């Protein structure tokens, strides 16, 4: 958990302009959060990048989890191995608002972070899931009560988030 170069936005939310994969390799946190889908198929966005950095070990493990437990619910999560990136990976499913899933479930998705004291995480539902990234940061700030270090890999978006937050 040796986080460097973060900006503190609130008592418990920190933000950095970095690829979450590079942060995980440098820090080796206790928990890295994945922005997953209900079948844990890590095909693109943050999920594809984290799985690629484990050389598909995350996908093989996720397929075994689904074989034994079935899919997650939207707003739900599971804890799996973090492989070479972290001790654990918290896979969290935010709503895919572009497919009519209710944005109210973004609060349920961020509530899963509260089971862990410290996490390295991305913005949920802000990739191909279509939610406004500044709205996603507002829900994170209003819902997460443990210590969360957010990595955002787009400088243009990082600057808009810091300006809107202060
Ligand atoms: C979730 C998105 C709003 C965000 N993407 C990411 N944020 C942090 N590390 C990442 N690695 C690969 C993708 C990626 C933005 F930068 F595009």
From Swiss-Prot:
Domain of life: Viruses
Membrane topology: Multi-pass membrane protein
Description of activity control: Inhibited in vitro by GRL-0617.
Domain called Macro: residue spans: 1-166
Reaction catalysed by this enzyme: Thiol-dependent hydrolysis of ester, thioester, amide, peptide and isopeptide bonds formed by the C-terminal Gly of ubiquitin (a 76-residue protein attached to proteins as an intracellular targeting signal)
Subcellular location(s) of the protein: Host endoplasmic reticulum membrane
Function: Responsible for the cleavages located at the N-terminus of the replicase polyprotein. Participates together with nsp4 in the assembly of virally-induced cytoplasmic double-membrane vesicles necessary for viral replication. Antagonizes innate immune induction of type I interferon by blocking the phosphorylation, dimerization and subsequent nuclear translocation of host IRF3. Also prevents host NF-kappa-B signaling. In addition, PL-PRO possesses a deubiquitinating/deISGylating activity and processes both 'Lys-48'- and 'Lys-63'-linked polyubiquitin chains from cellular substrates.
Subunit and partners: May form homohexamers. Interacts with N protein.
Protein name per its UniProtKB record: Papain-like protease nsp3
The species this protein was found in: Severe acute respiratory syndrome coronavirus 2 (2019-nCoV)
Taxonomy of the source species: Viruses, Riboviria, Orthornavirae, Pisuviricota, Pisoniviricetes
């Amino acid at each position: 958990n040796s986080f460097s170069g973060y900006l503190k936005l609130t008592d418990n939310v920190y933000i950095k302009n970095a690829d979450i994969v590079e942060e995980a390799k440098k820090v080796k946190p206790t928990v890295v959060v994945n922005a997953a889908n209900v079948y844990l198929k890590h095909g693109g966005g943050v999920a594809g990048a984290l799985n690629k950095a484990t050389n598909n070990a995350m996908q093989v493990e996720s397929d075994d989890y689904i074989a034994t437990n079935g899919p997650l619910k939207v707003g739900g999560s599971c804890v799996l191995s973090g492989h070479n990136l972290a001790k654990h990976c918290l896979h969290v499913v935010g709503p895919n608002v572009n497919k009519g899933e209710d944005i109210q479930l973004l609060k349920s998705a961020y509530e899963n972070f509260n089971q862990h004291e410290v996490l390295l995480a991305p913005l949920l539902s802000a990739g191909i899931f279509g939610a406004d990234p500044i709205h996603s940061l507002r829900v994170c700030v209003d819902t997460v009560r443990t210590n969360v270090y957010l990595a955002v890999f787009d400088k243009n978006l990082y600057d808009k988030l810091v300006s809107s937050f202060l």
